[PDB]
Design a protein around this ligand. Sequence first.
Ligand SMILES: C#CCOC[C@H]1O[C@@H](n2cnc3c(N)ncnc32)[C@H](O)[C@@H]1O
Length: 337
Amino acid sequence: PEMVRQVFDVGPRYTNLSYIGEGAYGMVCSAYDNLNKVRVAIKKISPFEHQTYCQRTLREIKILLRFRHENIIGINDIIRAPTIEQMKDVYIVQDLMETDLYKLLKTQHLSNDHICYFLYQILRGLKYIHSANVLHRDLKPSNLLLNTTCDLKICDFGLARVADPDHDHTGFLTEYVATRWYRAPEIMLNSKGYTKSIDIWSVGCILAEMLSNRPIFPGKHYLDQLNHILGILGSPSQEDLNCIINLKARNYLLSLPHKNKVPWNRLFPNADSKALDLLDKMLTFNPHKRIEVEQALAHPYLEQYYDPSDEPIAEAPFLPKEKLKELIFEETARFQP
Ligand SMILES: C#CCOC[C@H]1O[C@@H](n2cnc3c(N)ncnc32)[C@H](O)[C@@H]1O
């Protein structure tokens, strides 16, 4: 069995391995697909020793196998042992992508043309996800893969859920898992993140980051995240406060000194004015006034690309660690032998 840096037990179909980077649950390599005569990406996942790892693994596999969209990464193949007792790892094979938006923003200035194209592809993929009544819940630059000609594909649905807006309300300072800098303000106030507006906020943060190569709200701890957001948007209006019925949440906002909005064109003086109009509508404080994905696609900033007949939707809407391993075994059976 081939070894890298750790057994990489993917033969014989896949050979000529090359380390790419560490992942949540193991190694990511490129490898030559001796069947399709192309290099692919392979992710080694060793999750069976922790329930939370098994949850994220089953979610990714189940959703990505059901989804088929040009802007969403596919699963080409899954490698594991023939029996549950012998299965200690799972290998997910995907198209090989050159980079991701996180690594790209580290070193590359984006032209306005690239920003517009990236944002269109993000929203086009998100239209399909939301059409299936699914929330991604962890959109951020490192979960946006790019190939050598700047085709973009959303990946990592490990925290994704079915939308559940009737159960979205919670108390003030409720704990949350998804990446801090991309959390909507209502997560810190009264929301579990069970509605589609949680994803639009993240896309808004991603657009701001594309405009300046710096995360717009780099909060350093839970509550600091909310105070970063308020420092740019300014104090919420009386109407937006009155939508927050929870008293601990509302009284915290009331306790803060008045802060004025920072104009987007001051924060991003080189930005296209239409880009900043859309940014404003995505980074709206009140989640019920925040723009939806299909409205965002129809915004003048994206008029070069907008074609709703070429922006498809899904055909239909979409635990102990021992038990999750069983379901992972069964979900991956279609790729055997
Ligand atoms: C798991 C995980 C996240 O970090 C994974 C490393 O794998 C990378 N990566 C993940 N999927 C692919 C992929 N499909 N093609 C190329 N590189 C990839 C990611 O950009 C990073 O370099």
